[PDB]
Amino acid sequence: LFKPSLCYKFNDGSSYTITNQDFKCLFNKDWVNDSILDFFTKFYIESSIEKSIIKREQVHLMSSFFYTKLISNPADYYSNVKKWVNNTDLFSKKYVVIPINISYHWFSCIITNLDAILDFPLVNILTFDSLRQTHSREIDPIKEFLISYALDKYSIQLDKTQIKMKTCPVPQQPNMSDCGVHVILNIRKFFENPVETIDVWKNSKIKSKHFTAKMINKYFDKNERNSARKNLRHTLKLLQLNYISYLKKENLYEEVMQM
């Protein structure tokens, strides 16, 4: 039982509802659905903002549906998401976070250095995947998005060769259905210290593949990944219990259960 559904309010006024249908994917090794993943990427970035690790204005988090909308009609990537990005200002962000959901395979990228383009310089799309794969083909639509975005919002002519996909090492584990859990924890780790994480990835080719694997596995707490699913359940379950306490304090519990 995960009832009533969790209703969580973030400090930017946004509200998320997590139902039992969403919560139950955190059992066994079920595919992590969009609700769980978008909630937790939001959750851990807000935590980073609360701790003053980053400032709110430095980060833009896309929901997982952005990329799917982007490529829904490849005759014109930008037209697909033009309304989506109305009244955004992505090139003032230090970190633009884009989780990617393709054929039940989760991975993610983080766009850096956009805030250096306006002042003007290489845009780095930091792409990380728990499977042993590189994503040139899937990141290319994001390159074209950035070029069109730059022209549309700032009248800037942005050269594609200024935009580089960087394959960033994170713990690897071949369960595709665990990929959503790795995305959550990789993003979470990044925003406990972005500058340091960027440096770890940047220097991932200085030492041998074996030295780097140990370094990457330690930095990203690979030894805890086996239990990550359970810890996410405990976090949600706990957030729900506090919500129930709130509902019972305000005498709203019966109304919500009825509805």
Tell me the sheet residues that pair with 108: 99, 128
Burial 239-255 (b: 16+ CB within 10 A, else e): bbeebbeebeeeeebee
Task: Specify the number of domains making up the chain.
Answer: 1
Is the Cα dihedral 172, 177, 179, 181 positive or negative? Answer: negative
**Cβ contact 110:97 at 8 Å:** yes
**Cβ contact 131:176 at 8 Å:** yes
Domain coverage including residue 105: 1-259
**Cβ contact 124:166 at 8 Å:** yes
State residue 8 phi and psi, 5-degree precision: -115, 135
Pick from 141, 142, 111, 139: nearest CA to 126: 111
**Cβ contact 145:78 at 8 Å:** yes
CA distance 7 to 180: 21
- Method by which the coordinates were obtained: X-ray
Max Cα distance, the chain (Å): 61
**Cβ contact 194:52 at 8 Å:** no
Q: Which residues are CB-neighbours of 82 under 8 A, at least 6 positions away?
A: 152
State residue 96 phi and psi, 5-degree precision: -115, 120
User: Torsion-angle region of residue 52: left (phi > 0), alpha (psi -120 to 50) or beta?
Assistant: left
CA distance 57 to 14: 16
Q: How far is CA 251 from the centre of its chain?
A: 36
